[PDB]
Design a protein around this ligand. Structure first.
Ligand code: SRA
Ligand code: SRA
Lengths: 126, 124
């Protein structure tokens, strides 16, 4: 199983430490394809190739980010299963387009609190 | 001719006044098409019908990115507008999608958004 991870970078790196813990936990459920200056053309093409190869896409969507949204858009259009993880304690209301994309199966959006991310991942993969 | 406009809402409404100026100007060039489950389905229907997709990408937003992702996969022509004087660096995925043709990303200053739209649509 191959896993593609999405998380804000230029959108803001507030959750960078959490992302590292998510990527470490994903390694027990599959090969993490992502490597979250060749330039942005190179980054885009490399990532699209990885997204095509992915069996599942996991995104932490608490921090707003164009690139995370874009990856999820390309992923849906490729027919990839998607898990989005969101923390309501951020005080933000999650994107209408991401929340509304949820269908409870091919596209899941799960609210979670600090301390629960590993448990959420276990639940999804097991 | 139909146009779909994308701009941050829950990502932040900092540029909402600018979005209204964009939408006003787009009406010269075509019909501007533009709870959550309903919003998503309605918007995907509009996106599928749109001849061109226009996005102001200065404020980071998951929904705007999502719209652009779905639009690329649908084969729509896309214009993204970005303000470098905002002081942030535009998303690697949006900047990297640029090809100078069916996915264009234009840097502009806040006062010249109308001129940027004029240039694109007079060409298109
Ligand atoms: N340097 C990079 N190397 C690999 N991916 C990058 C890189 N920069 C950005 N990304 C991709 O873009 C997404 C973040 O979008 P952004 O708009 O915040 S730059 C990430 O999920 C990641 O997938
Ligand atoms: N209330 C709404 N009605 C129609 N579209 C909405 C609505 N709220 C958000 N959107 C769509 O989501 C995009 C913004 O994404 P966001 O993640 O900031 S909520 C907009 O370009 C818009 O297209």
């Amino acid at each position: 199983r191959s896993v593609y991870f999405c998380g804000s970078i230029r959108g803001g790196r507030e959750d960078q430490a959490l992302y590292a813990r998510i990527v470490s936990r994903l390694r027990r459920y599959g090969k993490v394809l992502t490597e979250h200056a060749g330039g942005d053309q190179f980054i885009h093409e490399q990532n699209l190739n990885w997204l095509q190869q992915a069996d599942v896409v996991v995104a932490e969507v608490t921090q707003p980010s164009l690139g995370v949204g874009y990856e999820l858009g390309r992923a849906v259009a490729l027919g990839k299963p998607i898990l989005c993880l969101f923390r309501p304690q951020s005080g933000r209301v999650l994107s209408a387009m991401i929340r509304g994309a949820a269908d409870g199966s091919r596209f899941q959006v799960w609210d979670y609190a600090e301390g629960e991310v590993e448990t959420m991942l276990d639940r999804y993969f097991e």
